[PDB]
Amino acid sequence: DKQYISYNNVHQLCQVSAERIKNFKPDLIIAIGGGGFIPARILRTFLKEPGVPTIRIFAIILSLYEDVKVSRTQWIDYEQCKLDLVGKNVLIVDEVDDTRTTLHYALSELEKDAAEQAKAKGIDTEKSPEMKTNFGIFVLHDKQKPKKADLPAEMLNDKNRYFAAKTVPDKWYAYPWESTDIVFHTRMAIEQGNDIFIPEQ
Amino acid sequence: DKQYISYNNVHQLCQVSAERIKNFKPDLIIAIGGGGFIPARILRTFLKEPGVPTIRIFAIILSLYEDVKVSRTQWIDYEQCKLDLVGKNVLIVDEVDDTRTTLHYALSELEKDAAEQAKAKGIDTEKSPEMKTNFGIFVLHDKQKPKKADLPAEMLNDKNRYFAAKTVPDKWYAYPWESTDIVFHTRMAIEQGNDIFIPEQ
Ligand SMILES: Nc1nc2c(ncn2[C@@H]2O[C@H](COP(=O)(O)O)[C@@H](O)[C@H]2O)c(=O)[nH]1
Ligand SMILES: Nc1nc2c(ncn2[C@@H]2O[C@H](COP(=O)(O)O)[C@@H](O)[C@H]2O)c(=O)[nH]1
Incomplete structure (x- = not known):
């Protein structure tokens, strides 16, 4: 019993979610895999405000193994990119939240990068809080079921640090860019009602 | 006079193009901007062959300035990614070919990376030509107008090296992921007849 998602649906999901996200006031987007890239890219079109330069999107690939083992298959070369996570608001994007496993580590690893960049600059997150990095999450779908890992309470709770375009019943979703x-x-x-829901203008 | 492109159209363009591309037998895809990423990601779904691991997609951002000036805004960290361009077939992806300027340099810079990664590897493409890197290009649209840059003739000639879904007229195309x-x-x-052109099965 699959759930078929249309491109146009994914598009409207981003659209509505665009607003709530406008609060977090993201400085950059980090997208997990191609899955998170597509919605991230769409998400951008909606966050564009006249004059203000368009937000940047950084793609990353993360491999998780067992017998947990993390592997930075493709990561952000902060060096050559000249990206400073310090005092910025990063928004992590990926299409769906299943067991949360993926985002758990994605957040984790990215947090290490922040705190270690902070040191390198000579800063002390403790003494000077404001210098800390604020992370946000965005997913088209967030399956409601038993998550086999978890994201920090304060964030997972605040409706402006964690956005799920839609929260849906434990099923398997087929995304447009997967279909042949x-x-x-x-x-x-x-x-199945998975097309638009916001008539034209 | 804009040309509106639907997601589903972009999807079918990739689909048909998938075949011709199957020859070049790409080892990896390098996508220019988010523009080239979306079609690149779709393109992948079609290149999947049972058993064989899914091809990798590397995103890159390239900034071109004047008063030509190239700027690697976001590049491939061959190091940590453990990517070897030597003796591989790279396919460059981007949505549209306008003045060719972008691909000109995109190819160029990537070629430098191959060369320098080839020499420092202790090899020479002259005596051992089975190691040089073969580059391919793929674009949904290729506008026919006089270009401003240019790619090697042997590549822009061999119909198994330069792939352009539909070869369109000089107009402005609005891609699905750009619309609000x-x-x-x-x-x-x-x-405008810019939706599907192939039916169900
Ligand atoms: N197409 C599709 N992929 C899914 C679905 N549930 C999980 N995935 C894939 O499995 C990954 C695992 O997510 P996690 O279970 O670690 O939270 C996702 O990022 C996604 O790539 C689903 O319903 N449909
Ligand atoms: N949406 C859209 N973008 C275009 C069009 N023509 C060029 N561009 C943008 O301009 C860039 C310049 O391509 P070039 O002119 O250097 O070959 C493209 O990669 C693309 O981002 C068009 O008709 N529609």
């Missing part, structure tokens, strides 16, 4: 027959995929999606 | 009203954008696209 978009036409079928689409027809299905429309038949 | 997908519904309108879509209706328009369908009315």
Whole structure:
């Protein structure tokens, strides 16, 4: 029993979520895999405000192994990119929250990068808090079920640090960019109510 | 006079292009900006062959300035990623070819990386030509107008090295992930015959 998602749906999800996200006032977006990149890119179009330069999106690939083992398959070369996580608001993007495992470590590893950058600059997060980095999360879908790992309480709780376009029942979702027959995929999606929901203007 | 492109169209363009591209037998994809990432990601779904691991996609941002000036805003950290361009077939992806300027330098800079990564490896493409790197290009659209830059002739000639989904006229194309009203954008696209061109199965 699959749930078919149309491109246009993913687009409207980002759209509505764009507003709530506008608070967190992100300084940059870090996208997990290609899965998180597509919505991240769309998400950007909506966060564009006249004059203000367009927010940057950094893609990262993260591999998790067992017998937990983390592996930075593709990471941000802060060096050559000249990216400073210090005192910035980072928004982590990925399509769906299943067991939360992925975001758990994604946040984790990125936090290490922040705190270690802070040292390198000679700063003390303790003595001078404001210098700390504020992390945010954004997912199209957040499955409601038993999560096999977890994200820090204060964030997971604040409705302006963790955004789930939609929270949905434990099922398997097929995303437009995965299908080898978009036409079928689409027809299905429309038949399950997974197409638009915000009529034209 | 804009040309509205639907997500589903971009999807089918990749689909058909997937075949011709299957020859070049790409070892990895390097995507220019988010623009090239979305189609690159889709393109992947179609290149998947049972058993064989899924091809990797590397995103890069390239800034070009004048008064030409190149700036690696975001590049591939071959180091930590453990990526070897030597003797591999790289496919460069980006949504549209306008003045070719972008791809000109994108290819250029990436070629430097291959060369320098080839020499410092203790090899020479002259005596051992089975090691040089073969570059490929893929764009949804390739506008026909007089270009401002240029790619090597042997590549822009061999129809198994330069892939352009649909070769379009000189106009301005609005891509789905750019629109702030997908519904309108879509209706328009369908009315210009810029939606699907292949049916279900
Ligand atoms: N297409 C699709 N991928 C899923 C689904 N649930 C999980 N995934 C994939 O599995 C990864 C694991 O997420 P986690 O379980 O660690 O929170 C996701 O990022 C995503 O790539 C689903 O319903 N549909
Ligand atoms: N949306 C859109 N972007 C375009 C169009 N033509 C060029 N661009 C943008 O301009 C860049 C310049 O490409 P170049 O002119 O250097 O070959 C493209 O990669 C793309 O981001 C168009 O018709 N529509």
